[PDB]
Coordinates of all heavy atoms in Angstrom, one line a residue:
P1 N -25.1 166.3 27.2 CA -24.5 165.0 27.5 C -23.4 164.6 26.6 O -22.4 164.0 27.0 CB -25.6 164.1 27.6 CG -26.7 164.7 26.6 CD -26.6 166.1 27.0
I2 N -23.5 164.9 25.3 CA -22.5 164.5 24.3 C -21.9 165.7 23.6 O -22.6 166.5 23.1 CB -23.0 163.5 23.2 CG1 -23.9 162.5 23.8 CG2 -21.9 162.9 22.5 CD1 -25.4 162.9 24.1
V3 N -20.5 165.8 23.6 CA -19.8 166.9 22.9 C -18.9 166.3 21.9 O -18.3 165.3 22.1 CB -19.1 167.7 24.0 CG1 -18.1 166.8 24.7 CG2 -18.4 168.9 23.3
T4 N -18.7 167.1 20.8 CA -17.8 166.7 19.7 C -16.6 167.6 19.6 O -16.7 168.8 19.5 CB -18.6 166.6 18.4 OG1 -19.8 165.9 18.5 CG2 -17.7 166.1 17.3
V5 N -15.4 167.0 19.6 CA -14.2 167.7 19.4 C -13.6 167.3 18.1 O -12.8 166.3 18.1 CB -13.2 167.5 20.6 CG1 -11.9 168.1 20.3 CG2 -13.8 168.0 21.9
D6 N -13.9 168.0 17.0 CA -13.3 167.6 15.7 C -12.3 168.7 15.2 O -12.2 169.8 15.9 CB -14.5 167.5 14.7 CG -15.3 168.7 14.5 OD1 -14.6 169.7 14.2 OD2 -16.5 168.7 14.7
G7 N -11.7 168.4 14.1 CA -10.7 169.3 13.6 C -11.3 170.2 12.5 O -10.6 170.7 11.6
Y8 N -12.6 170.4 12.5 CA -13.3 171.2 11.6 C -13.2 172.7 12.0 O -12.4 173.1 12.8 CB -14.7 170.8 11.4 CG -14.8 169.4 10.7 CD1 -14.7 168.3 11.5 CD2 -14.9 169.3 9.3 CE1 -14.6 167.0 10.9 CE2 -14.9 168.0 8.7 CZ -14.7 166.9 9.5 OH -14.7 165.6 8.9
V9 N -14.1 173.6 11.4 CA -13.9 175.0 11.8 C -15.1 175.8 12.2 O -15.1 177.0 12.0 CB -13.3 175.7 10.6 CG1 -12.0 175.1 10.2 CG2 -14.2 175.7 9.4
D10 N -16.2 175.2 12.7 CA -17.3 176.0 13.1 C -17.1 176.6 14.5 O -16.9 175.9 15.5 CB -18.6 175.1 13.2 CG -19.9 176.0 13.3 OD1 -20.1 176.6 14.4 OD2 -20.7 176.1 12.4
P11 N -17.0 178.0 14.5 CA -16.7 178.7 15.7 C -17.8 178.6 16.8 O -17.5 178.5 18.0 CB -16.6 180.2 15.2 CG -17.5 180.2 14.1 CD -17.2 178.9 13.4
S12 N -19.1 178.6 16.4 CA -20.2 178.5 17.4 C -19.9 177.3 18.3 O -19.7 176.2 17.9 CB -21.5 178.3 16.6 OG -21.8 179.4 15.8
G13 N -20.0 177.6 19.6 CA -19.8 176.6 20.6 C -20.8 175.4 20.5 O -20.7 174.6 19.7
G14 N -21.7 175.5 21.5 CA -22.7 174.4 21.5 C -22.2 173.1 21.8 O -21.6 172.8 22.9
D15 N -22.5 172.1 20.9 CA -22.0 170.7 21.1 C -20.7 170.4 20.3 O -20.2 169.3 20.5 CB -23.1 169.8 20.6 CG -23.4 170.0 19.1 OD1 -23.0 171.0 18.5 OD2 -24.2 169.1 18.5
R16 N -20.3 171.4 19.5 CA -19.0 171.1 18.8 C -17.9 172.1 19.1 O -18.1 173.3 19.2 CB -19.3 171.3 17.3 CG -20.2 170.3 16.6 CD -20.4 170.6 15.1 NE -19.1 170.5 14.4 CZ -18.9 171.0 13.2 NH1 -19.9 171.6 12.5 NH2 -17.7 170.9 12.6
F17 N -16.7 171.5 19.4 CA -15.5 172.2 19.7 C -14.6 172.0 18.5 O -13.9 171.0 18.5 CB -15.0 171.7 21.0 CG -13.7 172.4 21.4 CD1 -13.5 173.7 21.2 CD2 -12.7 171.7 22.2 CE1 -12.3 174.4 21.6 CE2 -11.5 172.4 22.6 CZ -11.3 173.7 22.3
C18 N -14.6 172.9 17.6 CA -13.8 172.8 16.4 C -12.4 173.3 16.6 O -12.1 174.5 16.7 CB -14.5 173.6 15.2 SG -16.1 172.9 14.8
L19 N -11.4 172.4 16.6 CA -10.0 172.7 16.8 C -9.4 173.3 15.5 O -8.4 173.9 15.6 CB -9.2 171.5 17.2 CG -9.4 170.9 18.6 CD1 -10.9 170.9 19.0 CD2 -8.9 169.5 18.7
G20 N -10.0 173.0 14.4 CA -9.4 173.5 13.1 C -9.5 175.0 13.0 O -8.9 175.6 12.1
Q21 N -10.3 175.6 13.8 CA -10.5 177.1 13.7 C -9.7 177.8 14.8 O -9.9 179.0 15.0 CB -12.0 177.4 13.8 CG -12.6 177.1 15.1 CD -13.1 178.3 15.9 OE1 -13.7 178.1 16.9 NE2 -12.8 179.5 15.4
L22 N -8.8 177.1 15.4 CA -7.9 177.8 16.5 C -6.6 178.2 15.9 O -6.0 177.4 15.2 CB -7.7 176.8 17.6 CG -9.0 176.3 18.3 CD1 -8.7 175.4 19.5 CD2 -9.8 177.5 18.8
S23 N -6.2 179.4 16.1 CA -5.0 179.9 15.6 C -3.8 179.8 16.6 O -4.1 179.6 17.8 CB -5.1 181.4 15.2 OG -6.1 181.6 14.2
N24 N -2.6 179.8 16.1 CA -1.4 179.7 16.9 C -0.2 180.2 16.1 O 0.2 179.6 15.1 CB -1.2 178.3 17.4 CG 0.1 178.1 18.1 OD1 0.6 179.0 18.8 ND2 0.7 176.9 17.9
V25 N 0.5 181.2 16.6 CA 1.7 181.8 16.0 C 2.8 180.8 16.0 O 3.6 180.8 15.0 CB 2.1 183.1 16.7 CG1 0.9 184.1 16.6 CG2 2.4 182.9 18.1
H26 N 3.0 180.1 17.1 CA 4.0 179.1 17.2 C 3.9 177.9 16.3 O 4.8 177.2 16.0 CB 4.2 178.6 18.7 CG 4.4 179.7 19.7 ND1 5.5 180.6 19.6 CD2 3.7 180.2 20.8 CE1 5.5 181.4 20.6 NE2 4.4 181.2 21.3
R27 N 2.6 177.6 16.0 CA 2.3 176.4 15.1 C 3.3 176.2 14.0 O 3.8 177.2 13.4 CB 0.9 176.7 14.5 CG 0.4 175.5 13.7 CD -1.1 175.6 13.4 NE -1.9 175.7 14.6 CZ -3.1 176.1 14.6 NH1 -3.7 176.5 13.5 NH2 -3.8 176.0 15.8
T28 N 3.7 174.9 13.8 CA 4.7 174.6 12.8 C 4.1 173.8 11.6 O 2.9 173.7 11.4 CB 5.7 173.7 13.4 OG1 5.1 172.5 14.0 CG2 6.5 174.4 14.5
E29 N 5.0 173.4 10.8 CA 4.7 172.7 9.6 C 4.2 171.2 9.9 O 3.4 170.7 9.2 CB 5.9 172.6 8.7 CG 7.2 172.3 9.5 CD 7.3 170.9 10.0 OE1 6.7 170.0 9.4 OE2 8.1 170.7 11.0
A30 N 4.7 170.7 11.0 CA 4.4 169.3 11.4 C 3.0 169.3 12.1 O 2.3 168.3 12.1 CB 5.5 168.8 12.4
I31 N 2.6 170.4 12.7 CA 1.3 170.4 13.4 C 0.2 170.7 12.4 O -0.9 170.1 12.5 CB 1.3 171.5 14.5 CG1 2.5 171.1 15.5 CG2 0.0 171.5 15.2 CD1 2.6 172.1 16.7
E32 N 0.5 171.6 11.5 CA -0.6 172.0 10.5 C -0.9 170.7 9.8 O -2.1 170.4 9.4 CB 0.0 173.0 9.5 CG -1.0 174.0 9.0 CD -0.4 175.3 8.6 OE1 0.9 175.4 8.5 OE2 -1.1 176.3 8.4
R33 N 0.1 169.8 9.7 CA -0.1 168.5 9.1 C -1.0 167.6 9.9 O -2.0 167.2 9.4 CB 1.3 167.9 8.9 CG 1.5 167.0 7.6 CD 3.0 166.7 7.5 NE 3.6 166.1 8.7 CZ 4.8 165.7 8.8 NH1 5.7 165.7 7.8 NH2 5.3 165.1 10.0
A34 N -0.6 167.3 11.1 CA -1.4 166.5 12.0 C -2.8 167.0 12.2 O -3.8 166.3 12.0 CB -0.7 166.4 13.4
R35 N -3.0 168.3 12.5 CA -4.3 168.9 12.6 C -5.2 168.6 11.4 O -6.5 168.4 11.6 CB -4.2 170.4 12.7 CG -3.5 170.9 14.0 CD -3.1 172.4 13.9 NE -4.2 173.3 13.4 CZ -5.3 173.5 14.1 NH1 -5.5 172.9 15.2 NH2 -6.2 174.3 13.5
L36 N -4.7 168.5 10.3 CA -5.4 168.1 9.0 C -6.1 166.8 9.2 O -7.2 166.6 8.5 CB -4.4 168.1 7.9 CG -4.5 169.0 6.7 CD1 -4.4 170.4 7.1 CD2 -3.4 168.7 5.6
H37 N -5.6 165.9 10.0 CA -6.2 164.6 10.2 C -7.1 164.4 11.4 O -7.6 163.3 11.6 CB -5.1 163.6 10.2 CG -4.2 163.6 8.9 ND1 -4.7 163.3 7.7 CD2 -3.0 164.1 8.8 CE1 -3.8 163.5 6.8 NE2 -2.7 164.0 7.4
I38 N -7.3 165.4 12.2 CA -8.2 165.2 13.4 C -9.5 164.7 12.9 O -10.1 163.8 13.4 CB -8.4 166.6 14.1 CG1 -7.0 167.1 14.7 CG2 -9.4 166.3 15.3 CD1 -7.1 168.3 15.5
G39 N -10.1 165.4 11.9 CA -11.4 165.0 11.3 C -12.5 165.1 12.3 O -12.6 166.1 13.1
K40 N -13.5 164.2 12.2 CA -14.7 164.2 13.1 C -14.2 164.1 14.6 O -15.0 164.1 15.5 CB -15.6 163.1 12.7 CG -16.1 163.2 11.3 CD -17.0 161.9 10.9 CE -17.4 162.0 9.5 NZ -18.2 163.2 9.2
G41 N -12.9 163.9 14.7 CA -12.3 163.7 16.0 C -13.0 162.6 16.9 O -13.1 161.5 16.5
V42 N -13.3 163.0 18.1 CA -14.0 162.1 19.0 C -15.2 162.7 19.6 O -15.6 163.8 19.2 CB -13.0 161.7 20.2 CG1 -11.7 161.3 19.6 CG2 -12.9 162.9 21.1
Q43 N -15.8 162.0 20.6 CA -17.0 162.5 21.3 C -16.8 162.2 22.8 O -16.3 161.2 23.2 CB -18.2 161.9 20.8 CG -18.7 162.4 19.5 CD -20.1 161.9 19.1 OE1 -20.7 162.3 18.1 NE2 -20.7 161.0 19.9
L44 N -17.3 163.1 23.6 CA -17.3 162.9 25.1 C -18.7 162.9 25.6 O -19.4 163.9 25.4 CB -16.4 164.0 25.7 CG -15.0 164.2 25.1 CD1 -14.4 165.4 25.7 CD2 -14.2 163.0 25.3
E45 N -19.1 161.8 26.1 CA -20.5 161.7 26.7 C -20.5 161.5 28.2 O -19.7 160.8 28.7 CB -21.2 160.6 26.0 CG -22.7 160.4 26.4 CD -23.2 159.1 25.9 OE1 -23.2 158.8 24.7 OE2 -23.7 158.3 26.8
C46 N -21.5 162.2 28.9 CA -21.6 162.0 30.3 C -22.8 161.2 30.6 O -24.0 161.6 30.3 CB -21.7 163.4 30.9 SG -21.7 163.4 32.7

């Protein structure tokens, strides 16, 4: 029912979707910056 989308780095799916562990060749200096602040991000509950 509740899922977490944070900017951390745990690959295991489950209840956490860690965006900090996603790679991107196009990624820039401005995005690496913003990504740093996602943090605990948000939560989506059904």
